[PDB]
Write a protein that binds this ligand. Structure first.
Ligand code: H6P
Length: 190
């Protein structure tokens, strides 16, 4: 099952994703090396910042993409809740209750309640993975509208969104809602 995944990684360019603290919801803590994020017990008290998510428990990478083919890997470990993918630069960061859907500028999938994998389509799409991933590969092909997710350990395909037509820069995006020991960690380029 790994053959195509290996071929795709050799084609797509490895992205060096560093988390941007100025975007992170106040309930989130970004590590000193900007490679991991954890949910805090209580929100931090920060001054006003137009980059920050006020409602979704989200953080972005520092760099966006407007063309090309890119790949990065996220260690999710045994964390029981997480959603990851990309989002448009112009998502509404200051508006309560926006649903994270492609129409609102998010292409994300992940895990909830320990064992329920979903793609964040409208309505949400339930997934069934034969094995729980510990590392997830995200593939972005801007020109073809491809945003794909793979189990990065055994190379199995997880989900690809309906072909998109991107018109805004895209950021890696990470969401965590629950308080638990395991953080979300970006794997660096070898
Ligand atoms: C409360 C919150 C996110 C949960 O949104 P939702 O409650 O709409 O559920 P989901 O289908 O997981 O997006 C803040 O990021």
């Amino acid at each position: 099952g790994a053959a195509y995944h290996e071929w795709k990684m050799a084609l797509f360019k490895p992205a060096d994703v560093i988390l941007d603290p100025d975007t992170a919801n106040a309930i989130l803590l970004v590590s000193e090396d900007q490679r991991s994020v954890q949910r805090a017990e209580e929100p931090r008290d920060l001054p006003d910042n137009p980059e920050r998510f006020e409602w979704h428990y989200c953080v972005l990478g520092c760099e966006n993409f407007t063309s090309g083919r890119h790949y990065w890997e996220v260690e999710v470990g045994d964390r029981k809740e997480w959603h990851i993918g990309v989002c448009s630069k112009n998502v509404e960061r200051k508006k309560g209750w926006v649903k994270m859907t492609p129409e609102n500028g998010y292409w994300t999938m992940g895990l909830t309640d320990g064992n329920k994998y979903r793609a964040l389509t409208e309505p949400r799409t339930n997934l069934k993975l034969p094995e729980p991933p510990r590392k997830v590969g995200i593939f972005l092909d801007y020109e073809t509208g491809e945003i794909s997710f793979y189990n990065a350990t055994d190379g199995s395909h997880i989900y690809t969104f309906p072909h998109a037509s991107f018109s805004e820069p895209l950021y890696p995006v990470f969401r965590i809602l629950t308080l638990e020991p395991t953080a979300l960690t970006i794997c660096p380029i070898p």
